[PDB]
Amino acid sequence: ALATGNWGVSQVLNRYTYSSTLSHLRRTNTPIAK
Amino acid sequence: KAIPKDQRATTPYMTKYERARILGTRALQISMNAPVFVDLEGETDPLRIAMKELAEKKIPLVIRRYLPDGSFEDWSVEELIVDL
Amino acid sequence: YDRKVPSPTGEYVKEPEWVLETDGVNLSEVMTVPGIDPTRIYTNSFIDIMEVLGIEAGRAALYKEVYNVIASDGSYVNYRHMALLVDVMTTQGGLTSVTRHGFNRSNTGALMRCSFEETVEILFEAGASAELDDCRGVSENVILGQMAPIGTGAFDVMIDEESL
Amino acid sequence: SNTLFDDIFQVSEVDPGRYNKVCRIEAASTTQDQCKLTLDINVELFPVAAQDSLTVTIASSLTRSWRPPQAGDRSLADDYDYVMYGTAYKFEEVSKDLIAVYYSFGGLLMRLEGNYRNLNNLKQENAYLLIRR
Amino acid sequence: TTKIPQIGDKFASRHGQKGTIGITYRREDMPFTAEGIVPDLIINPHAIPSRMTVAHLIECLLSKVAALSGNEGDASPFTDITVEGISKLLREHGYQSRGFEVMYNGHTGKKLMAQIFFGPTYYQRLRHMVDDKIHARARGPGLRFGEMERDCMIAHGAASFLKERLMEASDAFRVHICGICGLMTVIA
Amino acid sequence: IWGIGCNP
Amino acid sequence: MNAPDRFELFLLGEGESKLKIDPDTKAPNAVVITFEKEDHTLGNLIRAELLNDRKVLFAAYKVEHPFFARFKLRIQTTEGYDPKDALKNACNSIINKLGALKTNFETEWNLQTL
Amino acid sequence: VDFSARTVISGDPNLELDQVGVPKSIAKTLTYPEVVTPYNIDRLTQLVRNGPNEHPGAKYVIRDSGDRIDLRYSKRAGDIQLQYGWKVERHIMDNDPVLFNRQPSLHKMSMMAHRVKVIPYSTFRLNLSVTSPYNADFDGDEMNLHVPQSEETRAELSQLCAVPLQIVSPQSNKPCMGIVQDTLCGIRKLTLRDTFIELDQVLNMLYWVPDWDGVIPTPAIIKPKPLWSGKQILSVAIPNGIHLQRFDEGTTLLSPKDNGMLIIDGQIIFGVVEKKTVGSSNGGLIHVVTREKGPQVCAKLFGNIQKVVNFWLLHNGFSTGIGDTIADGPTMREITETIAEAKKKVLDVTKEAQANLLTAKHGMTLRESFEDNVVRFLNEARDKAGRLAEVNLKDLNNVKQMVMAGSKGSFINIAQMSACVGQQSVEGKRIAFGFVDRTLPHFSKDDYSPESKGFVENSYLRGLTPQEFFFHAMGGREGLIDTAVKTAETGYIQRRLVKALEDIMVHYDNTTRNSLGNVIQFIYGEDGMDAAHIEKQSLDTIGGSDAAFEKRYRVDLLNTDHTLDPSLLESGSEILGDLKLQVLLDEEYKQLVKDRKFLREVFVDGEANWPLPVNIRRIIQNAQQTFHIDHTKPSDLTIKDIVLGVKDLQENLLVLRGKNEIIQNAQRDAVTLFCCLLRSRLATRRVLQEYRLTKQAFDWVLSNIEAQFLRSVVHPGEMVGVLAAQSIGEPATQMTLKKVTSGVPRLKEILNVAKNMKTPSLTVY
Amino acid sequence: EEGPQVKIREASKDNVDFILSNVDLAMANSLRRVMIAEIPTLAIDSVEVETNTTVLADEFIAHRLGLIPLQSMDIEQLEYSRDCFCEDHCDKCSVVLTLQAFGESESTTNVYSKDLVIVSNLMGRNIGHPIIQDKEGNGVLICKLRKGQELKLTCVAKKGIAKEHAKWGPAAAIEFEYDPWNKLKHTDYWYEQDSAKEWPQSKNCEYEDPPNEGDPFDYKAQADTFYMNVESVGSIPVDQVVVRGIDTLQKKVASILLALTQM
Amino acid sequence: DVDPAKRIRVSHHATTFTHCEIHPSMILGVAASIIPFPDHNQSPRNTYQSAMGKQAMGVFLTNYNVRMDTMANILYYPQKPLGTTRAMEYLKFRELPAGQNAIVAIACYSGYNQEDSMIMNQSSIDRGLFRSLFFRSYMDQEKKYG
Amino acid sequence: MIVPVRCFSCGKVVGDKWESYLNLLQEDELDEGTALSRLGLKRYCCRRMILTHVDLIEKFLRYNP
Ligand SMILES: [Mn+2]
Ligand SMILES: [Zn+2]
Ligand SMILES: [Zn+2]
Ligand SMILES: [Zn+2]
């Protein structure tokens, strides 16, 4: 599960830039009114 | 089903599609060493030559225009007026 | 609304008039109410227009609607284009939708792009229905290695035995 | 070989209108109360003020490319200061009883309003504009 | 691999507007300031009005002052810093307060009739470069031709191009056919 | 962005 | 990869001459010279000096495309006056000017303390 | 997808409109098979020697038998004697027609033929004016370049898709390409009265125009200094025989404000040159040149103009900074109070409504009409705050300079930067009470003030406050969201439209039919005309009082007053009282009178300008310059000349030819509206007193109209259906944003023939 | 001496503030450009790396090395490898240097251009000596080594020009100005309220006479008198940059007279 | 008696305050915390930026030389931006920056920078402006069950 | 990583002023603005070169191998 995202829940950590990494770790997601 | 040289109600003018297909068809022949019908006053480019033949009304081709029902008219590249 | 009208002297002048804009439609019944001008009544529901006034009026209203949608962004589009759309949607006496109606066609041939992983079924019916492919499409002619009877190929070229 | 107009004008107003090097002048004619003038002028090169008095001669002489010096030693057909050269896009207004004509100096416009010019000016481009003092 | 800025590489300020290098000029050709300062980068003024990206303009004005005075420029949101305040600080340094500067054309040395907003601004180099998408697939022995492309060619009435392009490799086979039944049941 | 009867 | 070698801005590749002189047909007494491996440094110069000559009817230069190092110079002159000569002249006239300038500089240089 | 390439694009002021810069490295990958012929045995021989690694080279040589000799690996790569009949797969060279295209391509103008121009560094390069028809910008866009593989195919492209042949598009019957961005901004500055150029610079500028004849135009100023006009030199880029007249707000023949535009014989006479003249506008200079000089000459125009202005702009310079977004100290006080005033108007409507004094507008809630007013108030503020800022900005103001020229920027943009940003909003309303009875936890409950509900008082320059910031982000997000939607929904509609019309074509009987052969239109567009040859023209006979109509057209030879003065005509005095001619002049007038009736029925509105073929007003302006017609001497035209001449011309404007009665009627119908325009332009009094045509000029005007007309008919074979689908779909991919359903959602309701409209409305008069 | 006249204001080992007068703007400019793009100079143009355990990359280091200004006083007495009849590089067209550094101490060991060592034979000409102008004779900081890390290198200086690469550029900047009082009206000043009050008065406004209120526009004045100031980077004595500037520009027009001639 | 240059704000008619924001600029996330003067920018533009910061090159980590990851881009000469944010401190931006302070001129020059393209200084490119390292690493093993 | 050798914009040699600049701060307790002018960095292009540099090499050196 941690290698896939089967519970896209798990992703390969970004590392293009430092802030880009910080951002990825603080990211939220909403599966599926406004 | 053919229509007599008289009674052709189609345009006396050549369509831009006919100009393009004739010029392209002629250019292909010129590009394959087929005999030419004009004086290449320098031209060496097939299409550029074909264009010269057209202007000089020397392209021995006929355009068969079909009508929706099957009948059809025949105009010669010679007849067709070239204004576009 | 301001209305451009010929004045008695001839030039167009504005003649403001009161108009009623409704939320909800019932053309056949309101049209008949006394006091109105049944001759000018309108509605953006071209469907209702076509059922009360007929297909020709339905066509006009459909042009006026497609037109307003394009003029809403200030965009301009020559008449013939929207006119052509509106005629195709109308040719058969009724309002035929554009946004893909049939699961198999709208004006194609059992040859053009084999739709569905089961084109076999499109062919099966064509066979059992004695379908006749005109071969005017680009795809059906590609399968046939020939050039489509369109534009540059809407005619044949031949050698002329006249030229001296 | 020629000359077409001559007279002295009373600058009744000089308008700069958001421009910085050009002003539109409107001067009356000494003599005939008819003849008037509205003209654009590169002020930077020939300043002008109200109640001034310019001498305005049109003419059309002394199209082949243009040369710079040599002539500055010879055909000094310029006994004036300001000297333009435009085209006549003249709309012989034939307004009422007076005949007003138009000139275009590469953007700088000019308009005369008289009536005796019926055999004075051209109906054609080539036309110079000379002004002195 | 080392990657050196080239035509086609993407770059952007921190105000949501990227752009690619269209051409590079050598210092000699660049326009220049009296102090001999020349720009590292020249962007277009037409890309300013519409974007509503005013901050880019202020960051510049702010940055110039910071560099001239060696102090870090505060570009934090919701503070009392003003273009007016920043223009005063920059004026104190001897420059025309709104970031403009007289500049000279590098081919002539002659001044420009217009003064140029000149100053530092933080730019970022983005990935995905030219030599990474210059793919050219010409086989003889995006980048596709899809339904939409075919529709454009039909609109042009260019049928033989359409035939030439959509046709495959399959050998042009020669079959015989009955004129009565249109079948390939002819014995030749 | 702009207001009502316009863009948000 | 697509970038041509930088030396191609000042080094004549093969088959290339420093100058290509051509007779302008549009006008008489006019010629068009193609300077190869040269830019605005020599163009505006020879152009500018070519203008101080009064027997010169026309002088202009332009580098059609910033990519390639080469500019075109068109010269037109009064009859009897060969443009080729005007160029020669515009050159010498320049070479001198720079010699003079050079001197005056080395002169003022000495009179300086530091 | 063989014989194609893709890469980032960059603009290039030095390429010609129809060229495409092809990086040398990509040019060695794409080949074109060319049969060995004596006209090219050397060129090819030379290429084969260069090989697959040098540019003008080739990758393969194919002999009779069909043998493929690989030039990169082949012990004979340097020992090959090409023979007539063989084919050499050479690299694409300069001038090969290639198909350049940018996806998504919902236009035909987005797949055009270009001439190759091999160049160094990677990336494709386009002329800046071919940018809009491709909807491309150079912030990372990539484009595909397809190489025609045969001789007929080559022709098809350069004779049908070639960029020049696409300048005037049928989608909106006007040019789809014009001068933009930098050249637009510069062409204006270059045309002001205050713009002069000195001899030394003029010579370069002149030399820059490649079609210059070396004839140094004579200075507009010879006096203390030989000085040229900005207008003067531009006029060099414009070819001879080009005339153009346009009158703006208060343009006189002395246009005080250098307004309007007057060009005569390819020399501008007055008026600043901006978007109304050099843009992709209707009667504009690009439209005119195309029609008068041809597609090739017009294509060259773009490059000529570009080169002159760009050069001039390189040495003048242009820029923009924070300075340009700053408004007068006093203006800022005026703006601040203007809003402060709106918050009083809104505050009073509140006290009112809180007292229960507001009166609901029939069919509306108190709260609905309450909001309605606050929104009208606030917007009036925003607007007036914006104009105050607009008015201030001087002419130095660069932001304003861009706006005045046409290139990027509008009022709304200047207004949000300088004056009030405006009112945010989600779903057509002010920011909703997300928290219970409040927009943010910083306000108190039941606060309908503007600050609470989303009005952003500050400009971008001044900065937003945290609350203003969040609210502006709420509004911001709404746009991003449906830019995503709008994007998707349109790429599917455009495909539904193509699919439905794709098979409709014009046949040799001028009929429009579908694959089955069914008639959709008995004549295309109901007029047989080609959309790309139609221009908006004024149907004069329709407007004005009757007094005006008769004064303009009435010719009564039998009336000392309403006759043709013997000065307009040569036979003017001997025609007075002529009965026989008067019968001719009465056929014409009654015909004009019917026409006016007729037109007033077709356009019940009164609208006079409608797109029609053959711009008559222009044909006349040409005649009046070609035959140097002096408006002083009388004309040598006979009344019979005009009346019978114009009567005969009509019988020659053909769209249909069939010799039977049915088709002849169809023909009379198709040409009806056009003939109405004709008769009103060539009415006897007009010809003589207004145009002043001579018997010679007139006879020219006639045969020209007949030529242009026939040249305006649509050609059989036109894929008019795809054309229509794309003409409707393309703009439907431009709809991003008074209470009804519009935009895509509505277009989709229509195309769907949905029986459940969202906003069923009835309008009853 | 009649003609272009110099008139130095300041002068030193780095700058040459001067006033060109009696010269066409064009010449003032061409000279300005040449000093920037075409004055020959020596600079490392090839680096062979035997060992690099530094924290940087070879190409990284190699890049800086080429930016390290080198003594180019007698550069003309050296040739361009492309003309030299040798195979690659010889003492007639190049200068070889070495850089060997080992982080011996535990504290961070610095590497400077002073640590560069010529290994070729300068044959009497002052050339290749890494330029140094800092108060401690260290020169540019090429790299930094931690204890244990090493850097064995071999460079090859060659004659080059700015057009080819900015490393061969002898100049650093070139202040340039004219008509400090906008009398020729070559530029139109942008303003909010007052043109004069908003734009700072430059240095050279003291060296000139402010126009007078009523004086009409001087429409015949040209652009002479240019207030420059050249700044050398060190590879060449300031005075020289200008000097050699005027020179190279001189040999250019000359290579042209020789074309017409042999044409 | 109020600075006309400041932005206009509303009153404190609150005798009910129960809390107070530590600092309003904290409503922002990490990406937006790097935009200078985000409160003078059009709304959607802050968003586009927040996407592009993630496409810039910098120094993702200081131990970059020891990691063998699929791809990596390092700026040769990272600079700290002249104009910063107070939040930028806790983001280690001045420490591991991603960009350089380019001296930029807003101008219409040769016309080669229209429709969003840029004219860059070739000379500055020579001296190192914007150069970057690129590291791509390939992997591969050996057999399986056979 | 390390002090660029030269100022991107003009060429001024700057790779020799980093240690100085660093001392001008610590041991002389001056300010970056004054510190920079005293190093001869008068025009802002060269100023930004130092004032903005980030000496990341110092962090790389802390890695053992
Ligand atoms: Mn784009
Ligand atoms: Zn059979
Ligand atoms: Zn050697
Ligand atoms: Zn610097």
What is the span of the domain harbouring residue D55? Answer: 1-133
Q: For residue H104, is the peptide bond before it cis, meaning its omega torsion is within 30 degrees of 0?
A: yes
What resolution in Å is listed for this PDB structure?
2.8
Query: B22 with B60: CB under 8 angstroms?
Result: no
**Among the partner residues C19, C22, C151, nearest to H765 by beta-carbon distance:** C19
- Nearest C-alpha neighbor of H266 from the set H655, H702, H622: H622
CA H69, CA I250: separation in Å to the nearest integer?
Answer: 54
Task: Give the length of chain H.
Answer: 765
CA H255, CA H653: separation in Å to the nearest integer?
Answer: 39
Residues 6+ apart with CB under 8 A from E107: E29, G40, G44, H314, I29
H669 assigned to a ligand binding site: no
The verdict on a CB contact (< 8 Å) between J60 and A18 is yes
Rg value, chain G, Cα: 17
Helix (H, G, I), strand (E, B) or coil at D104: strand
What is the whole-number distance in angstroms between the Cα of residue H126 and the centre of ligand 1?
A: 14
Rg value, chain B, Cα: 14
**Among the partner residues H224, H396, H398, nearest to I191 by beta-carbon distance:** H396
Task: Give the length of chain I.
Answer: 263
Put simply, whether G7 touches E (Cβ < 8 Å) is: no
Query: E25 with J122: CB under 8 angstroms?
Result: yes
Helix (H, G, I), strand (E, B) or coil at A30: coil
Which ligand places an atom closest to the C-alpha of I84? 3
- Nearest C-alpha neighbor of E170 from the set B54, H340, C164, C144: C144
The highest-level CATH class for domain G1-114 is alpha beta
| Extended beta strands in H204-260, E state | 227-229, 244-246
Neighbours of H180 (CB within 10 A): 24
CA A4, CA H233: separation in Å to the nearest integer?
Answer: 68
Q: What is the CATH number of the domain that holds E90?
A: 2.40.270.10
Angle between helical axes of H285-293 and H616-626 (0-180°, round to 10): 70
- Nearest C-alpha neighbor of I164 from the set I89, I96, I80, I254: I80
Neighbours of E140 (CB within 10 A): 14
CA B29, CA B53: separation in Å to the nearest integer?
Answer: 12
Which method, experimentally, gave rise to this model? X-ray
Indicate whether H572 and H431 sit together in one domain. no
Bridge partners, C158 (sequence order): B62
Q: Pick the last residue of a domain from I135, I166, I197.
A: I166
- Nearest C-alpha neighbor of I6 from the set I15, I14, I17: I17
Which ligand places an atom closest to the C-alpha of I156? 3
CA K3, CA I138: separation in Å to the nearest integer?
Answer: 14
Number of domains in chain B: 1
Put simply, whether C133 touches H (Cβ < 8 Å) is: no
* B13-52 residues touching C, CB cutoff 8 A: 17-18, 20-22, 25
Distance of CA H533 to the CA centre of its chain: 13
The residue extents of the domains of chain G are: 1-114
Number of domains in chain D: 1
Helix (H, G, I), strand (E, B) or coil at I129: coil
Q: What is the CATH number of the domain that holds H117?
A: 2.40.40.20
Q: Pick the last residue of a domain from I140, I166, I192.
A: I166
Bridge partners, D114 (sequence order): D99
CA H133, CA H110: separation in Å to the nearest integer?
Answer: 6
List residues of J with catalytic annotation: 116
What is the whole-number distance in angstroms between the Cα of residue I218 and the centre of ligand 2?
A: 99
- Nearest C-alpha neighbor of I37 from the set I165, I216, I220: I165
- Nearest C-alpha neighbor of J84 from the set E19, K46, E121: E121
CA D83, CA D72: separation in Å to the nearest integer?
Answer: 14
CA atoms within 13 A on the CB side of D112: 28
Which ligand places an atom closest to the C-alpha of J124? 4
Backbone discontinuities in chain E, residue before each (C to N > 2.5 A): 141
CA H125, CA I11: separation in Å to the nearest integer?
Answer: 48
Query: H279 with H305: CB under 8 angstroms?
Result: no
H199 contacts in D (CB within 8 Å)?
Answer: 68
Phi-psi region of D2 (alpha: psi -120 to 50; beta: other; left: phi over 0): left
**Residue type for position K20:** S
CA C27, CA H762: separation in Å to the nearest integer?
Answer: 8
User: Over the range K15-36, which residues count as b (16 or more CB within 10 Å of their CB) and which as e?
Assistant: bbbbebbeebeeeeebebbebb
CA E120, CA E61: separation in Å to the nearest integer?
Answer: 8
The distance in angstroms from the start CA to the end CA of chain F is 4
Residues 6+ apart with CB under 8 A from I72: I40, I41, I42, I127, I170, I235, I236
- Could you tell me the CA-to-CA distances from H705 to H195, H711, I255 in Å, in that order? 40, 10, 62
Question: Which spans in chain E are helix H?
Answer: 54-69, 83-92, 147-155, 159-166
Tokens of G77: 């002159």
What is the span of the domain harbouring residue H111? Answer: 3-29+93-166
**Among the partner residues B15, B44, B65, nearest to H40 by beta-carbon distance:** B44
- Quick one: which H or E segment has residue H261? strand H261-263
Q: What is the CATH number of the domain that holds H268?
A: 1.10.274.100
3-state DSSP helix/strand/coil % of chain A, to nearest 5: 25, 0, 75
CA H675, CA H595: separation in Å to the nearest integer?
Answer: 9
- Nearest C-alpha neighbor of H319 from the set J115, J121, E44, E54: E44
Residue H395 carries which DSSP code? Answer: S
The verdict on a CB contact (< 8 Å) between G1 and E29 is no
CA C95, CA H128: separation in Å to the nearest integer?
Answer: 44
Q: How do strand H31-35 and strand H19-23 relate by DSSP bridges?
A: unpaired
Bridge partners, G21 (sequence order): G33
- Nearest C-alpha neighbor of G98 from the set H566, I244, C99: I244
What is the span of the domain harbouring residue K47? Answer: 1-65
Q: What is the CATH number of the domain that holds H365?
A: 1.10.132.30
Residue H162 carries which DSSP code? Answer: B
User: Sign of torsion, CA H460 H464 H469 H471?
Assistant: negative
CA H631, CA H617: separation in Å to the nearest integer?
Answer: 17
For chain I, what is the largest distance between any 2 Cα atoms, rounded to a whole number of angstroms? 77
Backbone discontinuities in chain F, residue before each (C to N > 2.5 A): none
- Could you tell me the CA-to-CA distances from J78 to B7, E61, E128, J53, J121 in Å, in that order? 82, 21, 19, 14, 18
| Extended beta strands in chain D, E state | 8-15, 22-29, 36-42, 53-57, 82-88, 99-105, 108-114, 127-132
Helix (H, G, I), strand (E, B) or coil at E151: helix
Residue J33 carries which DSSP code? Answer: G
Q: Pick the last residue of a domain from I131, I166, I201.
A: I166
What is the whole-number distance in angstroms between the Cα of residue H138 and the centre of ligand 1?
A: 7
The verdict on a CB contact (< 8 Å) between I219 and D47 is no
Indicate whether I47 and I159 sit together in one domain. yes
User: Over the range H588-602, which residues count as b (16 or more CB within 10 Å of their CB) and which as e?
Assistant: bbebbbebbeebbee
- Quick one: which H or E segment has residue H146? strand H142-146
For chain F, what is the largest distance between any 2 Cα atoms, rounded to a whole number of angstroms? 11
Q: How distant is the Cα of J140 from the closest Cα of chain H, in angstroms?
A: 31
I93 assigned to a ligand binding site: yes
Residues 6+ apart with CB under 8 A from H283: H244, H246, H535, H536, H615
What is the whole-number distance in angstroms between the Cα of residue G1 and the centre of ligand 1?
A: 25
Query: H716 with H506: CB under 8 angstroms?
Result: yes
Indicate whether H313 and H335 sit together in one domain. no
Phi-psi region of I139 (alpha: psi -120 to 50; beta: other; left: phi over 0): left
Residue with tokens 């937006």: J32
Indicate whether I144 and I227 sit together in one domain. no
E71 contacts in K (CB within 8 Å)?
Answer: 32-33
Indicate whether I57 and I151 sit together in one domain. yes
Indicate whether H224 and H75 sit together in one domain. no
Number of domains in chain I: 2
Tokens of D109: 């416009």
Number of domains in chain K: 1
Neighbours of H603 (CB within 10 A): 16
Put simply, whether I189 touches D (Cβ < 8 Å) is: no
- Touch criterion met for E and J (3+ Cβ pairs within 8 Å): yes
Put simply, whether I104 touches G (Cβ < 8 Å) is: no
K45 assigned to a ligand binding site: yes
- Nearest C-alpha neighbor of I29 from the set G53, G49, G96: G49
Tokens of K22: 């660093």
Kindly write down the DSSP assignment for every residue of G38-107, as one continuous string: --HHHHHHHHHHHHH-TTEEEEEEE-S-TTSSEEEEEEEE-TT--HHHHHHHHHHHHHHHHHHHHHHHHH
Query: I8 with I29: CB under 8 angstroms?
Result: no
Query: H94 with H116: CB under 8 angstroms?
Result: yes
Tokens of E53: 């990206």
Query: I142 with I111: CB under 8 angstroms?
Result: yes
CA I251, CA E1: separation in Å to the nearest integer?
Answer: 40
Kindly write down the DSSP assignment for every residue of H713-749, as one continuous string: BPPTT--HHHHHHHHHHTGGGS-----S--HHHHHHH
Query: H155 with B23: CB under 8 angstroms?
Result: yes
Distance of CA H306 to the CA centre of its chain: 18
Q: How do strand H97-101 and strand H111-119 relate by DSSP bridges?
A: antiparallel
Q: How distant is the Cα of H750 from the closest Cα of chain F, in angstroms?
A: 23
CA H635, CA H686: separation in Å to the nearest integer?
Answer: 12
Indicate whether H563 and H651 sit together in one domain. yes
Indicate whether H173 and H313 sit together in one domain. yes
Query: E108 with G44: CB under 8 angstroms?
Result: yes
Per-residue HEC secondary structure of chain C comes to: CCCEEECCCCCEEECCCCCEEEECCCHHHHCCCCCCCCCCCEECCHHHHHHHCCHHHHHHHHHHHHHHHHHCCCCCCCHHHHHHHHHHCCCCCCCCCCCCCCCCCCCCCCCCCCCCCCCHHHHHHHHHCCCCCCCCCHHHHHHCCCCCCCHHHCEEEEECCCCC
- Quick one: which H or E segment has residue H69? strand H68-70
- Nearest C-alpha neighbor of H524 from the set H725, H707, H726, H719: H719
What is the whole-number distance in angstroms between the Cα of residue H324 and the centre of ligand 1?
A: 27
Interior angle at CA C36, CA C32 and CA C42, nearest 5: 80
* E15-44 residues touching H, CB cutoff 8 A: 17-20, 22-23, 31, 44
CA K22, CA K3: separation in Å to the nearest integer?
Answer: 12
- Nearest C-alpha neighbor of G9 from the set H57, J123, H124: J123
What is the span of the domain harbouring residue B61? Answer: 1-84
- Could you tell me the CA-to-CA distances from I233 to B9, I16, K23 in Å, in that order? 85, 12, 23
Neighbours of H435 (CB within 10 A): 12
Q: How do strand D53-57 and strand D127-132 relate by DSSP bridges?
A: antiparallel
I188 contacts in D (CB within 8 Å)?
Answer: 20
What is the span of the domain harbouring residue E104? Answer: 5-141
The verdict on a CB contact (< 8 Å) between J122 and E47 is no
- Nearest C-alpha neighbor of I70 from the set I164, I155, I175: I155
- Nearest C-alpha neighbor of J75 from the set E22, H140, K54: K54
Closest residue in chain C to residue E163, using alpha carbons only: C147
Helix (H, G, I), strand (E, B) or coil at J6: coil
Task: Give the length of chain D.
Answer: 133
Residues 6+ apart with CB under 8 A from H401: H185, H188, H189, H318, H395
Burial class of residue H660, CB neighbours in 10 A (0-12, 13-18, 19+): exposed
Phi–psi pair at H671, nearest 5 degrees: -100, 0
CA B80, CA K55: separation in Å to the nearest integer?
Answer: 79
Q: What is the CATH number of the domain that holds K18?
A: 1.10.10.60
Helix (H, G, I), strand (E, B) or coil at H232: helix
Indicate whether H641 and H695 sit together in one domain. yes
Phi–psi pair at I232, nearest 5 degrees: -85, 155
**Residue type for position H216:** I
Phi-psi region of G15 (alpha: psi -120 to 50; beta: other; left: phi over 0): left
Tokens of C84: 């052509």
Helix (H, G, I), strand (E, B) or coil at H525: helix
3-state DSSP helix/strand/coil % of chain E, to nearest 5: 25, 20, 55
Tokens of C149: 């009877």
Put simply, whether E38 touches K (Cβ < 8 Å) is: yes
| Extended beta strands in I103-241, E state | 109-112, 117-118, 141-145, 150-160, 171-175, 226-232
What is the span of the domain harbouring residue I187? Answer: 1-40+167-263
What is the whole-number distance in angstroms between the Cα of residue H11 and the centre of ligand 1?
A: 13
